[PDB]
Amino acid sequence: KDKLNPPTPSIYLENKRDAFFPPLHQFCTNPKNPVTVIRGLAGALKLDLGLFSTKTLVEANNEHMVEVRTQLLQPADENWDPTGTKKIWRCESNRSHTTIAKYAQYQASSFQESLREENEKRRRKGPFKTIKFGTNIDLSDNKKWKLQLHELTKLPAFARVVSAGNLLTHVGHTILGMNTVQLYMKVPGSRTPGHQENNNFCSVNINIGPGDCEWFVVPEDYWGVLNDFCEKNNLNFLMSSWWPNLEDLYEANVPVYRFIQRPGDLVWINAGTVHWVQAVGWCNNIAWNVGPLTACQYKLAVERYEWNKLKSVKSPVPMVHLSWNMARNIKVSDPKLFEMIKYCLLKILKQYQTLREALVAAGKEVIWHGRTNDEPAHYCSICEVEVFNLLFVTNESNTQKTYIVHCHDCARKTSKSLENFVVLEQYKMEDLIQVYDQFTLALSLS
Template sequence: GKPPSSLAPVDPLKLKALSMGLSKELKIILIKMQSAGRQTFNISEVEEQRIPLCKISIKNTATEVIRACKGTRVKGKFKESFLLPAFSVKPNIDIEIPIPREKLNPPTPSIYLESKRDAFSPVLLQFCTDPKNAVTVIRGLAGSLRLNLGLFSTKSLVEANSDHAVEVRTQVQQPADENWDSSGSTQTWPCESSRSHTTIAKYAQYQASSFQESLQEEKESENEEEGEQTSDQSAATKIIKFGTNIDLSDPKRWKPQLQELLKLPAFMRVESSNNMLSHVGHTILGMNTVQLYMKVPGSRTPGHQENNNFCSVNINIGPGDCEWFAVHEHYWEAINKFCEKHGVDYLTGSWWPVLEDLYSSNIPVYRFIQRPGDLVWINAGTVHWVQAVGWCNNIAWNVGPLNSYQYQLALERFEWNEVKKVKSIVPMIHVSWNVARTIKINDQDTFKMIKHCLMQSIKHIQILRDQLVAAGKKICYQSRVKDEPAYYCNECDVEVFDLLFVTSENGSKKTYVVHCEDCARAKSPSLAGVVVLEQYRIEELMRTYDSFVLVSNTS
């Protein structure tokens, strides 16, 4: 039935009794019996089979999950992980055994494609997404696929959209394996860069004149007498500008550029049916859209894992090279500890690892050069940092191949972000439900993880719902519209799925603000002045849950 309106005077005890009464019902079935020619009814009691909540698993139906929730007394907030440790698919990497020094610089898996056909081979997808392979370089991919990278050259970009916005990072130029503190006396982790804005045309001018200057300097140093050589140490610190996060999402503005990228194999494309980011239902700039980087030598992308540990694709347009450093996901916590020790935030700060620190902690580092036309595939969760060797442009975006390793790492980071009060750019609960609605999964590990996440989601929703109704809080159903984004709490940035706690800021009808339950209660413990909206009928979620089944490979 309809929950009582919060406006009517309600006796909370009566409500509580009512909700408790409902949760323990005896099913009575009337059975027709023929007795000496007369029909009589016999009353038969059928005790509903209720499974305790702690015994519920993905083998249970949605109805059983809901019934178990209704029979549970949850004090305070129901807080359980969306992940089940037993389902983990992470590779076993032995960290106890010390790695000899020469093995701390392992060779980077580099693939040379013989033909265009090789690019579309399932073996390539398998190799790139293998949890053991942190990073794969596909050499000369642009040539194999006849990609016209000229479309992304500085000249073409200026011709296409000269006044387009560019974010600029001002940095100190230094060798790729060094990162000096401000006094220049010791190597350190924090690496500072200040942010400003310009346009493609203006940055293009800077990039070109920086190249001309360098030619000039080279010429002069050739002409100089040997004796007049200045030593590198005394050379003044050179300040450079790096043009970053240039948004190429607009299909009208960048039509030829985006069309060219459709030549890539499906698993590398910006959009494909097996890419979780194509099931978000809205744009996430730089993740399910292309971003461009314009560089001069020394331009640095500091250390990071991708948002929610998604994979990333990066193509060097040239003409210069880039140098990459990468570490397997397995070691991220050790790197996090170094960041803490150096007072820089791992998730949101700017840091450049001191290689010696990594080696002395037994952490292997992949180090390689990306030449023009090379594609770098960063596997899920790989920690990486990049520096331009020459003058070049790069294009990059994220993909979320629907496999168990990617899904697990994305959910792990989703939960870690919540602990750290950092926004998960990918709304994983929203995405998981969308995937369950639209994709047939034939891999058992992936299926179990997603199904478990949906089950946990239903539990969260049902228990919260029952608590609200028991407290006499009205819940208003308001179904979602096409392209409606996922919601995040205005205060703590956690994803808010299905049950939205909404207030109107300074009483104006125009601005509605979404909160999670905790932040809504922090403002108003009784939720007075808070409207609770429900975006999905529980029956709808139950149907999706029950019809999400493992599909056999043959079908």
């Protein structure tokens, strides 16, 4: 089917007017568009991409940490077992650390060697060469990266790291790599393997250049098919490194979007869109997440939040904490989105009331503990689930005032009658009830 190789949703900007035009915002967040390629974005805004060149990065912070992935240099769009016999889903991707200065030396010498090879003139496949990919470089420190982060404020508001319409701005604290910028340094063949974004939040990626990247994209509502493929091939969809066999996908009638990202092109990945990427030339990229205020985004975030619990994987976004912040601080005028949030809050409230009464009925004391504001959400020190309001802390951690948090289930498993724990409460019930009761649908004529 030609429908199995659909065209790329793609917008071509010439100037600042095009970039700030509101129908662009609406196109990107439309659930029918799994990905949007915004071509010419840097040129239209006169963004200085030179602030992210390797030369500039070395000067700025030469000892900065870089995560290295050591990989095989594979042909075109394929992934072969090391022997070169058959195409398989499993990637080879070994981890180590280096610095910006050291990776930079390698990136440059890699290009010089390729020039010389090009001038040396002239098991079904392979054997394959080894390459290194510098990934997940942390650009959160505004003191170390002042000029770099300022340049990204030139973007239209919907695409910024920080904005009033961004759910990740309303979380109220830092989530590393999501509401902070990540940087990637590349040589040809550098691969970011198959994945969905953390808790299915949208993402922004800009190619710094000078070389191109090639992207592969599958819509959110086929993610289940790719999950089945991973399990059949003995891989964890959420945690393993895998690179889809395009012939397998075609056979299973899964459509695949495929396109080239040139320097200055911005790629918008919509919520839950499955994707994997490879460098075609020598380049750097920057990326972060954004959470549009839509029913579709909130729904997919909640779904992945609950799926992660079943798979014993931590959620970087604390969706209970976020939901309360939305009710406290945000006027919601879409009836669909409003009903979703109200439903979730009522479920949180009922569970909390049920647990609290059980504790009281058993004669366990609930200790008023309160809360520092802008204090981050808490997670269980053993199982890493989000823990809200009622915190379970050992007698000794309480005494030492280290307040090491446990969920109810993990505390019970340790201490059958909770005799080794105290129960801390960060919010009064009457106050949460008020927030819930006062959270009402706002009128908007839009």
